Amino acid sequence: SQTVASHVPFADLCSTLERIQKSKGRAEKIRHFREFLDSWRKFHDALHKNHKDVTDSFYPAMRLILPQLERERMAYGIKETMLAKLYIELLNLPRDGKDALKLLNYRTPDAGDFAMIAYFVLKPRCLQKGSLTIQQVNDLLDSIASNNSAKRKDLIKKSLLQLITQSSALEQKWLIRMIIKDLKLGVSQQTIFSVFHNDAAELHNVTTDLEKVCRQLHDP
């Protein structure tokens, strides 16, 4: 296609995020993040060797890794009780049942947020793994934000059901955390920006062109 995100599955991103969250100590989290960056550039190179000159922008992934910096999309207009009802009819669970109740009676506490509970409910029964790329997830989230800007809760529910019915339980966990806009990764935004930049700079391999260096040192 046109971009790397159109070929990277959303399951790769969700897997990376799950490893980061489950990792203790910054070294392992950072190492998984660098694993994901290296996989990204790897996809870029494979696509170029298959004669597909694609952008190498990481923004389609970074906007999901840092949802609270999301400014291209507007507010999703989704709160956790909507997700409770949604998940409470899609599932065919008994209203005020054992599992079903937990979603309604939820209180924001470490890592005991709504997404964790929804994942605990979805792991027993759910769909055929995942099938959407990062670009398709970004398109569906774009549709949710747009429909919210047009004041159409019905269409919000529509597009989000499109998201859910094509995603595995894990993918739904991290999707929920991306709509609520806090991932609880155990590592800071400052650190993510730092590892991103330091990765680029470490791999830049600046080449000393002595003539260009002379022209640089001779003129401010």
UniProtKB/Swiss-Prot annotation:
Main location: nucleus
Name of the gene this protein is made from: LIG4
Subunit structure: Interacts with XRCC4; the LIG4-XRCC4 subcomplex has a 1:2 stoichiometry and XRCC4 is required for LIG4 stability. Component of the core long-range non-homologous end joining (NHEJ) complex (also named DNA-PK complex) composed of PRKDC, LIG4, XRCC4, XRCC6/Ku70, XRCC5/Ku86 and NHEJ1/XLF. Additional component of the NHEJ complex includes PAXX. Following autophosphorylation, PRKDC dissociates from DNA, leading to formation of the short-range NHEJ complex, composed of LIG4, XRCC4, XRCC6/Ku70, XRCC5/Ku86 and NHEJ1/XLF. Interacts with DCLRE1C; the interaction is direct. Interacts with APLF.
Function: DNA ligase involved in DNA non-homologous end joining (NHEJ); required for double-strand break (DSB) repair and V(D)J recombination. Catalyzes the NHEJ ligation step of the broken DNA during DSB repair by resealing the DNA breaks after the gap filling is completed. Joins single-strand breaks in a double-stranded polydeoxynucleotide in an ATP-dependent reaction. LIG4 is mechanistically flexible: it can ligate nicks as well as compatible DNA overhangs alone, while in the presence of XRCC4, it can ligate ends with 2-nucleotides (nt) microhomology and 1-nt gaps.
Parent-record interval covered: 7 to 231 of 911
Source species of the chain: Homo sapiens (Human)
GO molecular function: ATP binding; DNA binding; DNA ligase (ATP) activity; DNA ligase activity; ligase activity; magnesium ion binding
The protein's name: DNA ligase 4
Similarity section: Belongs to the ATP-dependent DNA ligase family.
GO term, biological process aspect, one: cellular response to lithium ion
